[PDB]
Subunit: 304 residues, 6 copies
Amino acid sequence: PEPQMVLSPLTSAAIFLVVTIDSGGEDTVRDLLSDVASLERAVGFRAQPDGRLSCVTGIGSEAWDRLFSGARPAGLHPFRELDGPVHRAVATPGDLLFHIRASRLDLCFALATEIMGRLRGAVTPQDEVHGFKYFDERDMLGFVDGTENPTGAAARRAVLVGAEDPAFAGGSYAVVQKYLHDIDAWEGLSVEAQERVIGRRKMTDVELSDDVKPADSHVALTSVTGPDGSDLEILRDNMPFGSVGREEFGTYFIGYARTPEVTETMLERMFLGTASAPHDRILDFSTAVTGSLFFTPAADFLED
Amino acid sequence: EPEPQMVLSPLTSAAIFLVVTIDSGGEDTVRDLLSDVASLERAVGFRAQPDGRLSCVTGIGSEAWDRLFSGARPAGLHPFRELDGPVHRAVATPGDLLFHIRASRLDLCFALATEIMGRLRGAVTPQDEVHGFKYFDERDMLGFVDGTENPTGAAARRAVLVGAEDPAFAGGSYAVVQKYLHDIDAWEGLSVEAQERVIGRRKMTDVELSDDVKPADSHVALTSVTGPDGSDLEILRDNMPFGSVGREEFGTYFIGYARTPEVTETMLERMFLGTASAPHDRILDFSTAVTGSLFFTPAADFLEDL
Amino acid sequence: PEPQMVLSPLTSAAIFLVVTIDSGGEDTVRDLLSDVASLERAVGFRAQPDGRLSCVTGIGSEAWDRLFSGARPAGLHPFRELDGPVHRAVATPGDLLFHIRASRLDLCFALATEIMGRLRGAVTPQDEVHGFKYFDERDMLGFVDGTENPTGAAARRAVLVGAEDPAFAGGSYAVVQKYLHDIDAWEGLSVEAQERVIGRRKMTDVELSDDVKPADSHVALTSVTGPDGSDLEILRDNMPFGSVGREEFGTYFIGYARTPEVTETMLERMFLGTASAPHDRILDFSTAVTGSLFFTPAADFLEDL
Amino acid sequence: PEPQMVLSPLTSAAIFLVVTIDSGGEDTVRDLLSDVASLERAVGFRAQPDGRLSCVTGIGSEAWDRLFSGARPAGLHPFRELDGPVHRAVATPGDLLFHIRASRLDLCFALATEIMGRLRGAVTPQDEVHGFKYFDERDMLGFVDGTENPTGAAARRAVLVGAEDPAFAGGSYAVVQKYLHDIDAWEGLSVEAQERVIGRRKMTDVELSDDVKPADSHVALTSVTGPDGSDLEILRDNMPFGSVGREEFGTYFIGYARTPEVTETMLERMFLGTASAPHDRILDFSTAVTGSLFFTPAADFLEDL
Amino acid sequence: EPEPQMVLSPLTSAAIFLVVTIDSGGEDTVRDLLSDVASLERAVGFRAQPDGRLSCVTGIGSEAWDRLFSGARPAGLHPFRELDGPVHRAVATPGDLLFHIRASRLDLCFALATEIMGRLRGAVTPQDEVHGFKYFDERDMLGFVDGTENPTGAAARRAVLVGAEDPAFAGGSYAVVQKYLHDIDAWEGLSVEAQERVIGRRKMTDVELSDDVKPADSHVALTSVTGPDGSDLEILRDNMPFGSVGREEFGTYFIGYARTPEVTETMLERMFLGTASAPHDRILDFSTAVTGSLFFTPAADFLEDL
Amino acid sequence: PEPQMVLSPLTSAAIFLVVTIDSGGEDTVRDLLSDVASLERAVGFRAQPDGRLSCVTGIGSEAWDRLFSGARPAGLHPFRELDGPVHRAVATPGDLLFHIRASRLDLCFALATEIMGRLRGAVTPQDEVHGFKYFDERDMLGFVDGTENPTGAAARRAVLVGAEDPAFAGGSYAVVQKYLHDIDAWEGLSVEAQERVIGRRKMTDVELSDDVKPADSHVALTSVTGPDGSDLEILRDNMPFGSVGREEFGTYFIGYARTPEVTETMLERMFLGTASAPHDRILDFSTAVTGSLFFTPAADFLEDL
Ligand code: HEM
Ligand code: HEM
Ligand code: HEM
Ligand code: HEM
Ligand code: HEM
């Protein structure tokens, strides 16, 4: 069955839109959902062959119950707030996600305009971020960001619902968190101290050797094997964003996985820690201000 | 598994459409050329890797097939039927071989067409040659985005490629071509709003009109045909603009691929003969078909093994 | 006499930064003004030949008096509020303008970061806009925007200060205004009605002929002839911006001219009208929320601080 | 004086349009001429920065007298037919030339459409050619074509009218000829024989040494010295064109020069020959089927009308 | 199960070919390196998404295999067999590991090469290093378009990847490398017409000569090999030009992939030792092989499994 | 007087070829010098409009006297070896320099092939380096390299001979040195230590503040003011090159300037040091293995041979 564009690569531009559905807005939303692929093609065909416009649409747990009766995806539940001793992953409201990507911001903006035009009066905007590529795929911490994403068949196996939930095969689960960074504190570290926080070399993006990589480095904590042997993988399409006057330097985190348990395990390790690490050191420079979980159905579910 | 020709490939910036008829006695030369056409395509195309995107799709008409081949025939292959509506007509014009040549640059198309025609000189008579070009943001000469609702991915394969219904010809497709000339002086006299009602989509933004406002005789309404499965019937269109300003020739070269000609024919009947709701497609009040031919585009391995 | 990059073309990305200088922040600002070209090269050189990074720095009238002790450019004054019967061009605070352009937003953002890093604690931000190209050089009203900009020698003559003010030759004057548009109202007009508001055809960008072009159309009102029969020109580097959730669909207006008088005459025609036209119809769909005037000195002036 | 874009480089796409002016068409024509710069910008601005759209407009000898009162350019006369013993340079009708270039055919086509739409009923089309780049700047004979064109200051001196005709300074003269090639005959020659016809190496574009270069080679006959021993140069913007079904493999020749005497001297040498050479060997594989001469005035001459 | 290395990927504009021998006791460092090469590839390559197109194919020679690995060997893996023709020699030269690095830009290739060699310093001795570059429209140093008849799509997978005939190593391939230097002075003394007869294709247009004019000793005639069933045997070549004008080194770096070495060997035998009608490939009258090595390039998961 | 392409920007590919002239090869070399513009055009034209091919030809002091009679450029002498306490700038043979640049190596190689083909039997190659762009204009030390190059009028003033030596106006002097780097040692330093060696931030390429910039830092030692207070500048077109197997990680240094004394003053400061610096710390990780000085004449000098 045909997935949405959850497997597609990073692009140079993105718009992330999160909205809540107003009381009585359900019908309007359902009608838009049935049209969203049409709208994407309407805008996107204009910029063949380099436009690379896509839109992934996600639905929250509470929204699901308001919109649909009957079958629910097995892993769909509200984002779980994690209150660590020091750092907190907050749960914030969000019923629908539109993850819009293209090679140019205009395409993303034109599609978002059409979507929101159809939803005006039925939804309330919760968050809107316009993301942009930063040099050679860097984030606002200055590190190459996305390197260890799965590709090809390994990506398919890590991201797409299959025979464990066959009515929903071809779907995925998206976790979003908007992070703001303390760039003044971060820039007070040496490069070598930043490398130890992340677990990779800053300029060249080469992973630190195991004898050197700290236990509380980001890469250490988000490296998880299940009882099975295999690495647990997620597909991240994080984008930088910001505003210089407000001193806002951000990473918009979005991670896709076949079940949310994988992403949640990673978050637990980061925010609550392990026996050998109290928390991910990246959170000493990164504050999460949103957190929401969505199911992104197979394309044909929406088309109904 | 048979390897299709490049019938699922996207629109390109440049195209040449060449239609020829096979002269009496020319059959041998044509067979030879058909066996070499992939080699010719590589010879030219490899030069411009990786952004050339050269391809050539070769099609064979019904009458031609019967002249060329003792053996099995594609199940749906017949001559294009003239459609003589009360007002508008879809003419049937001669064509035995189609070459649909696309690239990101005209020079590649022209070089390959030169090589093909050089082989065929003295065995065929040219009927039509069109040099197509992309016009702004995938627009046609009417100013509308053209190709939006083409199928992609798996749906395209299912809509376009012959499968187990005709196993000897699996991986083939059917192409219909019509050269249309537009009355641009009449068209440009309409408001944008009236043009949108002819087509059924918004002109600048390419968004479909809502069902409550889209006329029954708009192009999109009449070419939207629901199959038994509840789903719309789909074709893949590779239409290209063409023209000549001095002669006031402003054209759309229509080419549509489908797994069976019955889909394209049903759309044509609705456009030219109308429905209970609609006398004919309003696009035809601004568009004249001057050619019409139907071709089978076999699997690439079919051509190779002549 | 080397100008700043005021004659450079439109790019696909821009950042517009307007700040005010805090009391006691004058010395820090002067140091930064002297280094801005070095900072531009530091970021820009990374992305040649296609980055096309540039930064034009402007200084307002009030700030000029706080920073510098010598002569003032002859045309430098605070932006003049225009209070029309129906529409108003507001004057808002702004001491320094940074007009940053590149083919990619990251270069603009990196440069803006370096500038603001130097200025933190000395300036208060007043406006920041991240502009982006919209299809085929369109604005948020869906019209091609920039067509009649002067080029070549005509641009230099229209834009650069010359012998009229010789101490400031190679400078220019920038007027900025942030406009928000009422897209719901605009989309209620037919295309033909919109054409009559602007004065050009929407899809093809061809000018309406003089017989059909309304006198209160934008193009008619911003077409001004000099006493010498000669068209008065400005150079506009307008960019779209916006936010869909807030229903913010914007034009960031920036115009460069050799004297502000040209830009002001255009604004007066638009907001106050003429004998033939009460006001520019574009303003029935556009609200100005900022308005500031800056002088952009020659590059050597800033270097020699 | 601002010239038209006569010094501008070769582009990947071009449209050449030649028309004649019907009875009573003059007013319509003059009105279009005053507007062509405006139309070019209207279309061209949409494809900043890479569109590279330009339009050069030329006016023939007879048409000049119909359109304009008073002074004529000194060198403007009808194309002179050259009836050689073997080959002939034909003269054909042509009142106006539009040489339209861009990086993409769509821009050229859009502009041509707007020009012709304004001229409907006033003109009769004579020729229309859609030219395209062929590999690495080759012509239909398979040679790199344009190499020795002048550049920079040498180009301005070879092409622009100056103080020798001061009322028309910044103009130029264009000669056009459409050539169709006998490719079957050409392809019957070895590469080494082709190189002796042209005077350059086929693959590498290197000029043959003087030891080896034949005197009836194309490059020998079109290399001409002025009485002061200096090289007479023209600027050629020729483009390939063709139709495979009609066996039509063409060179559209267009050459600009500050006086037509230079281009005429080259044509005389090619068609009529010299002491050492009966005619240019390229003409044994190339037939001229059009020939016309135009004056391309300074851009401001057209604007002023 | 089976995930190939990037042995099917297209030509790129830049390449680095690195051939090294393993020093005594360097086996552990090499094993470690091999398990990390994919990681290094991603570390460098992700920086230049989407256009960088960085890949690295790692090969292991016959003698190396037995020093590194316990257990089964690939069925086809043996040392390159020297071929001593009367006139021309295909030399066998040392080489334990091959790194075939490709990208759209040399910087990416160089950066990855730097990381690989930094890990291996002390454990290996360099034998050969060539930096290849695209030359015009996919030309080689003889001025001919080079690569044209490479198989594509399913035909390439069938020709290149090991399958059911050696299931433990399914998804692997065999690479043969030969560094050629050309005698350009002698070559450029030939007419174009003579050059075309050596190669068997037209020079400027890359169109194949018809078989009825193609010399039996032309390079294309001799490297056209029909198997038992009359099917063409195919290899995948990623040859690149290289050179130094000052020392008059004008080179072709030959690299050919095949699912068994026998195909590539047959072609080399035909070249260097000739047939009934042709003593040897005329291309060799203008080209000298100065290296020759054979490598197995395992499935990606094999290398990672260390 | 028209210069060679000495003011043109950095490109992503380059070939540097240094040859000596064999006894008896003088006539062959003179013929080639007169044809090099021709050759460049022959190859370059094929890759209009983006090839960006150029070749600058330089001639050393000893060669000059073998090739030419009469007046010589005022500053043309053999490269002066610098024997420092610790590091040495070696002088190596070189009679001609071809500095070839383009956006693609094939164009460089094709032109080099043509040149060398004309010179076979007359010259012996001394050095050939194929340079390549490294990420965002980085060198092998990982720093952005070229940032503070002069542009515009300042570049012209810094690089072209003028009235100080009027017979040779429009020429320049090129110094070349091939450096190999000890990357293993370099990588043992912290980023912060590397930054102190260079005088700029590694990732962002911003210059270190005056206060923290060491006296023996590269940028400090190559910042030079003349007696009149003016900054002495050179134009650098250095390119990375290397061979991983041989652990050769190189910077090919090439610097143009209107007099050798400017570049020589910088080299003296680097290798022999100053009051507050024994030598440039960059030399602790860089070894010069060639050193040659060439005069690059105006283009019209070459053509006139
Ligand atoms: C707070 C902002 C975040 C930043 C700036 C960030 C940055 C990075 C960087 C630079 C890397 C190394 C390069 C790479 O493989 O991509 C990395 C790896 C990773 N990050 Fe994050 N990350 C953040 C949040 C998250 C979150 C919230 C998760 C999971 C819930 C996550 C999961 C991962 C994973 C799985 C990897 C790959 C680790 C490996 O297998 O080597 N990150 N991240
Ligand atoms: C006469 C010249 C024609 C022009 C200028 C033209 C133009 C268009 C345009 C502008 C659209 C809407 C955007 C899109 O989906 O492509 C469209 C849709 C379509 N056209 Fe045409 N068309 C022409 C002829 C035909 C013909 C002859 C057929 C079939 C035999 C056809 C089949 C379709 C179909 C299937 C669609 C999609 C309808 C839907 O599902 O929304 N068209 N065409
Ligand atoms: C809401 C803000 C604005 C929008 C959306 C807008 C849009 C446009 C458009 C679409 C055009 C026609 C194409 C062109 O030549 O660029 C135009 C022309 C022009 N606009 Fe505006 N404009 C705005 C504000 C201004 C302001 C504030 C000024 C001057 C103070 C101005 C001065 C001009 C000028 C001089 C022209 C060229 C007129 C001519 O000579 O034909 N615009 N504008
Ligand atoms: C000596 C340096 C070599 C050069 C310069 C060279 C050049 C060429 C050229 C120009 C072609 C024609 C176009 C094409 O790629 O299809 C060709 C074809 C070919 N070459 Fe070579 N080649 C060389 C060595 C080899 C070697 C050593 C082999 C095999 C061991 C080989 C195998 C082939 C094959 C299989 C073809 C395709 C023939 C066909 O099926 O049409 N080449 N080569
Ligand atoms: C040894 C290898 C060399 C390396 C790797 C190197 C690298 C660099 C770097 C990274 C910079 C700072 C960025 C820039 O402005 O370009 C720089 C600046 C400079 N280098 Fe070097 N350089 C080398 C040798 C030389 C030599 C031999 C000279 C002169 C003889 C020289 C003259 C300069 C000058 C004039 C500057 C600009 C200083 C300023 O005004 O800010 N360099 N170099």
